[PDB]
Amino acid sequence: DEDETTALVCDNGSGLVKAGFAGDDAPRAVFPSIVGRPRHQGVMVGMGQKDSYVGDEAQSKRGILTLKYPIEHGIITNWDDMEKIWHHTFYNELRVAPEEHPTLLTEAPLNPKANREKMTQIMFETFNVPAMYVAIQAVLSLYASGRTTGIVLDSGDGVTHNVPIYEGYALPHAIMRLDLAGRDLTDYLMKILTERGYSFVTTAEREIVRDIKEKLCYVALDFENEMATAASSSSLEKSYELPDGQVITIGNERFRCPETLFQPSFIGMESAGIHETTYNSIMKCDIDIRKDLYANNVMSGGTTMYPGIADRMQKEITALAPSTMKIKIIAPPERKYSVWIGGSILASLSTFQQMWITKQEYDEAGPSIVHRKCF
């Protein structure tokens, strides 16, 4: 753009599309990736200004809407809303044509084979984007935190991932994937809420369950001990008087839902928490590779933003791992935009040119150009 090539960086997942230009610190355009439709019906003369209420516009006028969620855990429920989602991004906020710049996105690690092509097509065959790359999440983070080896656990909204990374990159044989992440914490809440006598069961209320969560519910440091502290109506109970009108006195639910990350005996599964799946990744590798993975355990995404989390893993991780060392969780001050800031650098370095898919390479290699360059 202007005197230089430049581009647009983009982290999109199951909950927020976070768009910006290139070189930038952290995001500019940001919106929930959802498309809403008018479930309230009746008729019209005056109308609340939309056919598809999208992202921001959507989340703001919740009531009439049946919020068609798309990317639940990297898999999209149906792709049709998605084109309107990205129709926001470029033209409406950023005012830039996709048909002009490079695009950086993120690979929501182990998003299916065909989704790679299907995405690149929406750009290159439908909306002729000049160059693009989708970068594989967890690793980006590492470099922005100034780390080369460590065990990263990156989870935002959609899917849990425990990545061992070193001075050279990981492989499917050791890394893991699980469905128990940030948004599942979000949704989980209502399964449990029943015992007080609440269950925001439907659409608009579904979104209020997310909202409650990120600004008040905290992680149990050691749940079991804290269970008797549920008698202490001070720590726990707090008022959420919904600005509509209904008090949700989120007592024990404020840490009982977080705990499911380290405790799947609460939903019903055999998954161990993210502290044990971290051993699960780390063990599977070569024998000499672990000493510095243990020296830095990178912890990022929307998932690691709750109050009381690094500290937890400090205890828990020691118990079933290798013993010998200075074990240490590195969770950056803002650690959620891990994906984004690591990505920024790549789409600011011109060295990145000895990688990407450029506009004519697609035509010259068909849809498959994505697995002809990448994987």
Ligand X SMILES: Nc1ncnc2c1ncn2[C@@H]1O[C@H](COP(=O)(O)OP(=O)(O)O)[C@@H](O)[C@H]1O
Contact 154, 74 (CB under 8 A): no
Residue nearest Ca ion, CB atom distance? 13
By CB under 6 A, the count of residues binding ligand X is: 19
- Tokens for 189, please give them: 């809440």
Q: Which of 166, 306, 356, 362 binds ligand X (CB under 6 A)?
A: 306
Determine how β-strand 329-330 pairs with β-strand 29-32: unpaired
Among 302, 332, 342, 343, interactor with ligand X by CB under 6 A: 302
CA 299 vs. chain centroid, Å, equals 13
The half-sphere exposure of 193 on its side-chain side, counting CA atoms within 13 A, is 20
Q: Which two tokens stand for residue 4?
A: 């230089």
- Binds 16, which of ligand X, Ca ion, none (CB < 5 to 8 A, cut-off by type)? ligand X
Residues 75, 130: Cα–Cα separation, whole Å: 25
Q: Cβ neighbours of residue 212 under 8 Å, at least 6 residues apart?
A: 189, 240, 248, 250
| φ, ψ of residue 100 in degrees (nearest 5) | -175, -40
113: its two tokens: 């084979």
Question: Per CB under 6 A, does 344 bind ligand X?
Answer: no
Stretch that binds ligand X, among 142-150, 190-198, 234-242, 300-308 (CB under 6 A): 300-308
Identity of the residue numbered 70: P
Q: Which entry of Ca ion, ligand X, none binds 335, CB below 5 to 8 A by partner kind?
A: none
Q: What, of ligand X, Ca ion, none, does residue 186 touch, CB below 5 to 8 Å by kind? A: ligand X
DSSP string, 222-236: SHHHHHHGGG-TTTS
Are the C-beta atoms of residues 170 and 142 closer than 8 Å to each other?
no
Exactly one of 88, 101, 161, 210 binds ligand X (CB under 6 A); which one?
A: 210
CB nearer to ligand X: pick between 137 and 278: 137
Q: Under rule CB under 6 A, which residues in 146-165 are in contact with ligand X? A: 156-158
| Cα distance between residue 7 and residue 349, in whole Å | 11
Q: Which residue, 60, 70, 307, is CA-closest to 208? A: 60
Residue 162 has φ and ψ, to the nearest 5°, of -120, 110
Comparing CA positions, the residue from 222, 190, 209, 189 lying closest to residue 308 is 222
Of the candidate residues 156, 164, 273, 342, the single one contacting Ca ion (CB under 5 A): 156
Q: Which of 94, 96, 190, 305 binds ligand X (CB under 6 A)?
A: 305
Least Å from the CB of residue 3 to ligand X: 32
Which of Ca ion, ligand X, none is residue 210 near (CB under 5 to 8 Å by kind)?
A: ligand X
Q: Does residue 183 interact with ligand X by CB under 6 A?
A: yes
Contact assessment for residue 90 and residue 2, using Cβ atoms and an 8 Å cutoff: no
Q: Which stretch binds Ca ion (CB under 5 A): 7-15, 174-182, 288-296, 348-356?
A: 7-15
Min dist. Cβ of residue 303 to Ca ion (A): 9
Residue 183 binding result from ligand X, Ca ion, none, given CB thresholds of 5 to 8 Å by partner type:
ligand X
Please say which residue, 55 or 156, places its beta carbon nearer to Ca ion: 156
27 lies in the site for ligand X, by CB under 6 A: no
Shortest Å, Cβ 227 to ligand X: 22
* Residue 336 binds which of Ca ion, ligand X, none (CB < 5-8 A, kind-dependent): ligand X
Q: Which residues bind Ca ion (CB under 5 A)?
A: 13, 156
Q: Which residues bind ligand X (CB under 6 A)?
A: 11, 13-16, 156-158, 182-183, 186, 210, 213-214, 301-302, 305-306, 336
